[PDB]
Design an enzyme around this catalytic site. Structure first.
Site, PDB file in Angstrom:
ATOM      1  N   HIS A 119       5.139   7.004   6.850  1.00  0.00           N
ATOM      2  CA  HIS A 119       4.962   6.592   5.484  1.00  0.00           C
ATOM      3  C   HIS A 119       4.465   7.812   4.705  1.00  0.00           C
ATOM      4  O   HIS A 119       4.250   8.883   5.274  1.00  0.00           O
ATOM      5  CB  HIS A 119       3.929   5.458   5.383  1.00  0.00           C
ATOM      6  CG  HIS A 119       2.593   5.861   5.895  1.00  0.00           C
ATOM      7  ND1 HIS A 119       2.264   5.776   7.228  1.00  0.00           N
ATOM      8  CD2 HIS A 119       1.536   6.436   5.271  1.00  0.00           C
ATOM      9  CE1 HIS A 119       1.037   6.247   7.394  1.00  0.00           C
ATOM     10  NE2 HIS A 119       0.586   6.672   6.233  1.00  0.00           N
TER      11      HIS A 119
ATOM     12  N   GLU B 170      -3.366  13.769   0.771  1.00  0.00           N
ATOM     13  CA  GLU B 170      -4.669  13.330   1.266  1.00  0.00           C
ATOM     14  C   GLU B 170      -5.430  14.545   1.790  1.00  0.00           C
ATOM     15  O   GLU B 170      -6.497  14.890   1.263  1.00  0.00           O
ATOM     16  CB  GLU B 170      -4.507  12.242   2.322  1.00  0.00           C
ATOM     17  CG  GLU B 170      -3.883  10.989   1.715  1.00  0.00           C
ATOM     18  CD  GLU B 170      -4.141   9.754   2.514  1.00  0.00           C
ATOM     19  OE1 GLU B 170      -3.972   9.806   3.755  1.00  0.00           O
ATOM     20  OE2 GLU B 170      -4.481   8.727   1.893  1.00  0.00           O
TER      21      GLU B 170
ATOM     22  N   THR C 237      -6.640   4.802   5.867  1.00  0.00           N
ATOM     23  CA  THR C 237      -6.775   3.500   5.233  1.00  0.00           C
ATOM     24  C   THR C 237      -7.667   2.611   6.082  1.00  0.00           C
ATOM     25  O   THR C 237      -7.815   2.832   7.285  1.00  0.00           O
ATOM     26  CB  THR C 237      -5.415   2.750   5.113  1.00  0.00           C
ATOM     27  OG1 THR C 237      -4.836   2.640   6.405  1.00  0.00           O
ATOM     28  CG2 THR C 237      -4.449   3.506   4.210  1.00  0.00           C
TER      29      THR C 237
ATOM     30  N   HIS D 147       0.851  -1.212   0.000  1.00  0.00           N
ATOM     31  CA  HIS D 147       0.000   0.000   0.000  1.00  0.00           C
ATOM     32  C   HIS D 147       0.879   1.252   0.000  1.00  0.00           C
ATOM     33  O   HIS D 147       0.474   2.294  -0.503  1.00  0.00           O
ATOM     34  CB  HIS D 147      -0.894   0.138   1.245  1.00  0.00           C
ATOM     35  CG  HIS D 147      -1.653  -1.100   1.617  1.00  0.00           C
ATOM     36  ND1 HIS D 147      -2.641  -1.646   0.820  1.00  0.00           N
ATOM     37  CD2 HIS D 147      -1.586  -1.877   2.723  1.00  0.00           C
ATOM     38  CE1 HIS D 147      -3.137  -2.721   1.415  1.00  0.00           C
ATOM     39  NE2 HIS D 147      -2.517  -2.880   2.572  1.00  0.00           N
TER      40      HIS D 147
ATOM     41  N   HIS E 213       3.053  11.032   6.725  1.00  0.00           N
ATOM     42  CA  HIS E 213       2.367  10.784   7.985  1.00  0.00           C
ATOM     43  C   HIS E 213       3.291  10.148   9.000  1.00  0.00           C
ATOM     44  O   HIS E 213       3.814   9.057   8.745  1.00  0.00           O
ATOM     45  CB  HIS E 213       1.180   9.841   7.749  1.00  0.00           C
ATOM     46  CG  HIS E 213       0.061  10.472   6.992  1.00  0.00           C
ATOM     47  ND1 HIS E 213      -0.930   9.737   6.373  1.00  0.00           N
ATOM     48  CD2 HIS E 213      -0.232  11.778   6.774  1.00  0.00           C
ATOM     49  CE1 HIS E 213      -1.775  10.570   5.782  1.00  0.00           C
ATOM     50  NE2 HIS E 213      -1.382  11.815   6.020  1.00  0.00           N
TER      51      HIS E 213
HETATM   52  C1  LIG Z   1      -2.863   1.654   8.344  1.00  0.00           C
HETATM   53  C2  LIG Z   1      -2.189   2.687   9.185  1.00  0.00           C
HETATM   54  C3  LIG Z   1      -1.760   3.835   8.266  1.00  0.00           C
HETATM   55  C4  LIG Z   1      -2.945   4.590   7.677  1.00  0.00           C
HETATM   56  C5  LIG Z   1      -2.439   5.709   6.769  1.00  0.00           C
HETATM   57  O1  LIG Z   1      -2.144   5.455   5.573  1.00  0.00           O
HETATM   58  O2  LIG Z   1      -2.326   6.906   7.188  1.00  0.00           O
HETATM   59  C6  LIG Z   1      -0.907   2.081   9.810  1.00  0.00           C
HETATM   60  C7  LIG Z   1      -0.239   3.090  10.743  1.00  0.00           C
HETATM   61  C8  LIG Z   1       0.439   2.285  11.855  1.00  0.00           C
HETATM   62  C9  LIG Z   1       0.372   0.873  11.310  1.00  0.00           C
HETATM   63  C10 LIG Z   1       0.725  -0.275  12.314  1.00  0.00           C
HETATM   64  C11 LIG Z   1       2.052  -0.147  12.991  1.00  0.00           C
HETATM   65  O3  LIG Z   1       3.049   0.049  12.074  1.00  0.00           O
HETATM   66  C12 LIG Z   1       2.378  -1.287  13.917  1.00  0.00           C
HETATM   67  C13 LIG Z   1       2.056  -2.655  13.359  1.00  0.00           C
HETATM   68  C14 LIG Z   1       3.201  -3.036  12.445  1.00  0.00           C
HETATM   69  C15 LIG Z   1       2.981  -4.401  11.842  1.00  0.00           C
HETATM   70  O4  LIG Z   1       4.003  -4.657  10.932  1.00  0.00           O
HETATM   71  C16 LIG Z   1       1.690  -4.516  11.123  1.00  0.00           C
HETATM   72  C17 LIG Z   1       0.526  -4.105  11.996  1.00  0.00           C
HETATM   73  C18 LIG Z   1       0.713  -2.747  12.646  1.00  0.00           C
HETATM   74  C19 LIG Z   1      -0.403  -2.648  13.646  1.00  0.00           C
HETATM   75  C20 LIG Z   1       0.528  -1.617  11.617  1.00  0.00           C
HETATM   76  C21 LIG Z   1      -0.860  -1.651  10.959  1.00  0.00           C
HETATM   77  C22 LIG Z   1      -1.003  -0.512   9.925  1.00  0.00           C
HETATM   78  O5  LIG Z   1      -0.022  -0.614   8.942  1.00  0.00           O
HETATM   79  C23 LIG Z   1      -0.971   0.819  10.647  1.00  0.00           C
HETATM   80  C24 LIG Z   1      -2.196   0.889  11.477  1.00  0.00           C
HETATM   81 MG   LIG Z   2      -3.652  -4.494   3.608  1.00  0.00          MG
HETATM   82 ZN   LIG Z   3      -1.078   7.746   5.805  1.00  0.00          ZN
END
Ligand SMILES: C[C@H](CCC(=O)O)[C@H]1CC[C@H]2[C@@H]3[C@H](O)C[C@@H]4C[C@H](O)CC[C@]4(C)[C@H]3C[C@H](O)[C@]12C
Ligand SMILES: [Mg+2]
Ligand SMILES: [Zn+2]
Length: 258
Positions: A92, A104, A197, A62, A117
């Site tokens: 990211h 966004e 997301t 993503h 972010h």
């Molecule tokens: C999806 C969201 C980002 C939304 C965005 O694009 O702004 C991201 C931000 C923090 C992320 C999390 C964190 O990085 C901590 C976890 C890391 C693991 O590798 C996967 C699940 C995990 C729980 C991730 C899930 C997802 O990728 C999260 C929730």
């Molecule tokens: Mg996914």
């Molecule tokens: Zn984001």
């Protein structure tokens, strides 16, 4: 799995699996500078990243995430609209298929080439998994990217992308200093919102900096060389991985500045 940024699994489809994607506090939003109100109650943001400990970078299909060691009270965000302390867990970007789109958040409908972010969780909930379920669980610091002079502190990120081109690839990414991704000013807008997301959880205090960082066309062009797909699968360039503005509904955006 299923969701993505395609015509058949993109933002318009997410609500079917994740009903809250059609909720009352969704992000991102358009920041209308007429509407946004100066709030003197707000304090200076405190961004303390001196001890931030980056670990690795991952293409998750993503975006690419840089992950941090969130074990100690290392890198924290506090102050501004926030109560207590929030730990940096990852950052990211979202970006476009060309320089005129990718952000966004928008500002008076203006889109930027990309948006960073920096994701933080509220230490009062003990860990990210618990925090993400609460209304004051996360703080995300959003920073616009505009195309211009290069951002030196982004170069280490851009140069590693060639090695994580496809979904599932990761690289060590230690000793990266995210302070090199910040603009001069910490002036900001803030509003209550959500993850942009799936699962779209309404757990985020958004802090969106008024000042963008400048990055070069070469740098952002490297983002677009990543792929949504895994190795050996047909090539789908990772571009336009942004969710568009959602309805503000009954929310007020506050500004930290006059
Ligand atoms: C999806 C969201 C980002 C939304 C965005 O694009 O702004 C991201 C931000 C923090 C992320 C999390 C964190 O990085 C901590 C976890 C890391 C693991 O590798 C996967 C699940 C995990 C729980 C991730 C899930 C997802 O990728 C999260 C929730
Ligand atoms: Mg996914
Ligand atoms: Zn984001």
């Amino acid at each position: 799995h299923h969701w993505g940024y395609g015509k058949h699994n993109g933002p318009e489809h997410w609500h079917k699996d994740f009903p809250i994607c059609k909720g009352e506090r969704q992000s991102p939003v358009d920041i209308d500078t007429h509407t946004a109100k100066y709030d003197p109650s707000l304090k200076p943001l405190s961004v303390s990243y001196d001890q931030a400990t980056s670990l690795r970078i991952l293409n998750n299909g993503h975006a690419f995430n840089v992950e941090f060691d969130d074990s100690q009270d290392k890198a924290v965000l506090k102050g501004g609209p926030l109560d207590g302390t929030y730990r940096l867990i990852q950052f990211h970007f979202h970006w476009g298929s060309h320089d005129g789109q990718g952000s966004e958040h928008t500002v008076d409908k203006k889109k930027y080439a990309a948006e960073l972010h920096l994701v933080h969780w509220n230490t009062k909930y003990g860990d990210f998994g618990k925090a993400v379920q609460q209304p004051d669980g996360l703080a995300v610091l959003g920073i616009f990217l505009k195309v211009g002079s290069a951002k030196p502190g982004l170069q280490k990120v851009v140069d590693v992308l060639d090695s994580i081109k496809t979904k599932g690839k990761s690289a060590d990414f230690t000793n990266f200093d995210p302070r090199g991704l910040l603009p001069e000013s910490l002036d900001y807008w803030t509003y209550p919102g959500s993850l942009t997301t799936p699962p779209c959880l309404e757990s985020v205090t958004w802090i969106v900096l008024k000042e963008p960082i400048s990055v070069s066309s070469e740098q952002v062009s490297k983002f677009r060389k990543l792929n949504f797909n895994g190795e050996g699968e047909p090539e789908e360039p990772m571009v336009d991985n942004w969710r568009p503005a959602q309805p503000l509904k009954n929310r007020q955006i506050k500004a930290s500045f006059k």
